[PDB]
Amino acid sequence: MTKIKSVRTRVWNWTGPTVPPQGNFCTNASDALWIASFRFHQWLTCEVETEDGTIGIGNAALAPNVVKQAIDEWYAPLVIGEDPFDYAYLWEKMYRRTHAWGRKGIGMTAISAIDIAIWDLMGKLVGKPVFKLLGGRTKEKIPVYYSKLYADSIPAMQAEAEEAQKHGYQGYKTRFGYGPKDGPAGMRENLKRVEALREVLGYDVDLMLECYMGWNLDYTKRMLPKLERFEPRWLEEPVIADDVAGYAELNAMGIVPISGGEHEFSVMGCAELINRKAVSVLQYDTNRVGGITAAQKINAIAEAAQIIVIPHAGQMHNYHLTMANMNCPISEYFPVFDVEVGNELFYYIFDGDPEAVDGYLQLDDDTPGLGITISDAHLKHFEITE
Template identity: 30%
Template sequence: MSKITAIETIHPSEVMPNLMLLRIHTDDGVIGHGETYFTPEAIAALIHDWMARRLIGADALAVESHWRFLYERSRSFGQPGAEMRALSAVDLALWDILGQTCGQPVWRLLGGPVRETIRIYNTCGGPNYGAAAKEGKESLDWPGYGDEGEPGPLQDNWASFHAAGDLAAELVSEGIGGMKLWPFDRFAHAKGGHQISWEDLETGMEPLREIRERVGMQIEIMVEGHAFFQLPAALRLADALREIKPCWLEDILPLDNP
């Protein structure tokens, strides 16, 4: 039995403020790596304060048993949230340990290949997306509250607002077949997500039109809504977006919308 001896959480705040990295150590020297995103301090506290009591000293290869135990005791707090993000990092690390122990990639342990190639798309965020607020900034840099990031390397959030055509052309040149962005989120909260004005709608459409003008249909466009809109605004958005032929609209409505 490969026994879990230590759990280590790492917060690389200078690289990506919302990222949390996880290492699970075993008595035979294998270290499994996992990661998760958003509120890293809260997730780290949850892992060390609660999940570690299940894991330390336990069999590191009992991946399904650990997942089931932690999931069944987390879901009473709701499906989303810090518990699920913590569990995802733990699950990744345990599968990594199993793969290393067996000398096999995890995809093979999960059943092997299904297809030879897959298409990929770029989520237009960036290292500081959704990070801590700058002093005095009302938006709190919260995703969807108007945070547009700062220009710089890998700052695709900023580029998706201010240089969407250039970003699309760059992605096409790299062989990336799609891009996901959220040009309407900044308008959702003024009216509780129930309405979006024609003026705001047109402003949000500008980067999407710029993408189509620059690269045409060479790239798929996915529009994210972060579940900020109610049905009347969502219907208006969906109707307007027919123009740019999106691949999909993601989480436009709240998860608990009836």
């Protein structure tokens, strides 16, 4: 065994071309304020190197500068000098030593970046793809749903839908543009948009609706009966992440399946969502929830409950987990587009993330680790701090 030598954490600030939303607008938790700032224009890379020179690559997107401070000051020192294959111990070490403040949020996100790197490292050390160490190939290939379709003018939304359709996706997710603050008029605008998409896409494909924590219990309860006729596959994050009780009440109404979890942290955090039937579809993001070590355990819990898992974001740190579990049927897919909201920013930082072909993704059976590398292609578009 070769021990961990160092942890290199860098924050990448996008300084390249940005595209004006051209009339875009999406709901979010801040809408309640009478003040969705495109959060992902920064990203964090975490490289864990062993004494033998092997390097594992991890990442995180939430508040990169704050997370970097946590990793450099508190977490990195906890894994230096340790065997990567004692990953469960290292995870617990970080989890308990900082439990007072790292339980959720910054801390768990920091743990996530380091843990993902440790898994990439393990795969490389034994020459196996990460998904093989997690269980192997449970699917021929991974079906994916087209993730985007922000609220806009009806013509604009229908044009995007028609374009997306040409690529074979069997699922499409769309984001609402109006919420509680927009009152009754906003409800109609929301419904008009879903109808417009069914007009183009038809009813024989999955249509997912996303609120991004922009609604509340009151508003959602009244919108559910109105959304039923469009037969959505699910309604995502209708309430803020702290309103777990609201999630459970909404999911129990049994009108439209409720999904969520991208803003939930730790194994016990997601176990509660599963056990309380707060969601019918769990969507944690491995680079937030605690890493692959935590996600693998969460997948076991969700599988026993038969609440399907479809991680938030389409990246290797999520794909390998999905490939290895029967209860993880499909993945979310952000197409390789220009930098707008930021979900696609990782494509400019890394090379190796699979691109969809006729609505499916594939993983190489041999490529060791996660199958990604940090790219030099866009260094010109980034101001990287270390």
